[PDB]
């Protein structure tokens, strides 16, 4: 099939086997005092296009990858332009994650969204003035997205095995090479900063390591596509 929005067009399989995060569709912000006093802009024409980040190379020893929203889009096109020039932000997202692998590869990946995903400060040293917090580069990786170090704990002190209460999906190289999630705005306050607070964070982890034969491709390409939904900006700062 094919999905065309704005100027972007990406093909996939025919599917209504798609998850709705917590069973609600995205939606614009209802009447608040902000909605009463001024109209925050409702861009729906061009900021809505399936952005395609740089492919990722899953290997036999790969730990996994993650990102941070909307921080991954803070410098990307007109959306980034709206993001660093409006201190009020709100949106939903359509995450379409594909892997491109042959039928001779095995391995299982987990796709999951995590709200308020907090990374952990490893290097235990109980000290107020030491405080080995993760640095700015790590907690806000940006566009490329960092990797993990201790997946069984999600680098957050939280076991992975219980990470399925999160809106998840299995990627098994046998049954399907693609998956898709839809996530609405998840925050305890209707708007916030798009630049110094991520609402949630995607994770991908190889729960069954890639394996193959002599003469196969050694690195599976995994791509992620993303399309915002019903976004809203407010407060144009210069």
């Amino acid at each position: 099939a094919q999905l065309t929005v704005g100027n972007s067009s990406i093909t996939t399989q025919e599917a209504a086997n798609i998850v709705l995060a917590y069973g609600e569709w995205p939606e614009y912000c209802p009447d608040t005092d902000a909605t009463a006093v001024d109209k925050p802009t409702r861009p729906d024409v061009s900021v809505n296009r399936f952005y395609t980040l740089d492919s990722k190379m899953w290997q036999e020893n790969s730990t996994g990858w993650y990102w941070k929203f909307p921080d991954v889009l803070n410098k990307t096109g007109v959306f980034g332009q709206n993001a660093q020039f409006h201190y009020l932000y709100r949106s939903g997202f359509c995450l379409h994650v594909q892997c491109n692998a042959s039928k001779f590869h095995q391995g299982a990946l987990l796709v999951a969204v995590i709200p308020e995903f907090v990374l952990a400060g490893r290097g235990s040293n109980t000290k107020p003035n030491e405080a080995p917090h993760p640095g700015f580069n790590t907690t806000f990786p940006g566009t490329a997205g960092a990797s993990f170090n201790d997946p069984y704990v999600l680098d957050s002190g939280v076991p992975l095995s219980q990470s399925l209460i999160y809106p998840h999906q299995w990627i098994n190289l046998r049954t399907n090479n693609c998956a898709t999630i839809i996530v609405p705005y998840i925050n305890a306050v209707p708007f916030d900063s798009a630049i110094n607070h991520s609402n949630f964070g995607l994770i991908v982890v190889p729960v069954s390591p890639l394996k193959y034969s002599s003469g196969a491709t050694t690195a599976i390409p995994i791509t992620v596509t993303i399309a915002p939904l019903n976004s809203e900006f407010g407060g144009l700062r210069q």
Binding site: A21, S161, K211
Partner: protein, 223 residues
Amino acid sequence: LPTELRPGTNQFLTTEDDTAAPILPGFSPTPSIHIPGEVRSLLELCRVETILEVNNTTDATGLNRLLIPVSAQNKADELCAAFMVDPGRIGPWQSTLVGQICRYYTQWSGSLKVTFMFTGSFMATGKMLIAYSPPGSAQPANRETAMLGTHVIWDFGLQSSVSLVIPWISNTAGVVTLWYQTNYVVPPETPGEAYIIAMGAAQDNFTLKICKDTDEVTQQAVL
């Protein structure tokens, strides 16, 4: 109005439900909004499929603790893996939210759902026996005495995500075993060594009772 007192005055029950003087009268809190992902009872959590730490040993250190190995180098008609079905016990359930939440309560009862997931090649094919043996018994010796009870087959060469419903449990416990009904059929040019994931959750009929704190948290406090 003349009255009298009775025993129970001036006492402070940590359990009792009573009001107290609202020290900020007329106060106006911040109103609520339709936050998605609400809950109303922990039972909602207990019916969600998590993963079992089925490979519990000293030799597996990371994710490998969650993956059941399977190879063609094993023979047919032999036992591949097995475990108990006991959430609030010292085993490969403590990694599972059902076991975690059972640790927060004394008595549970109901029916469970255990599923398995395969991850090898598309071209590969085999047949595993998934046999449940209810409590009051021993785990089966061979495949034959297991076939004479609640069992299913699973030709993961065709159907990957398999499930299973355990009828009853309360609070020795029942056992679940995975046998090689056949050998791991493998085409040329593929490593022929795959992994099985084991997931588990509770059904609707589950129920919990008296609450107790947990033990796994050895820390009294932090500050």
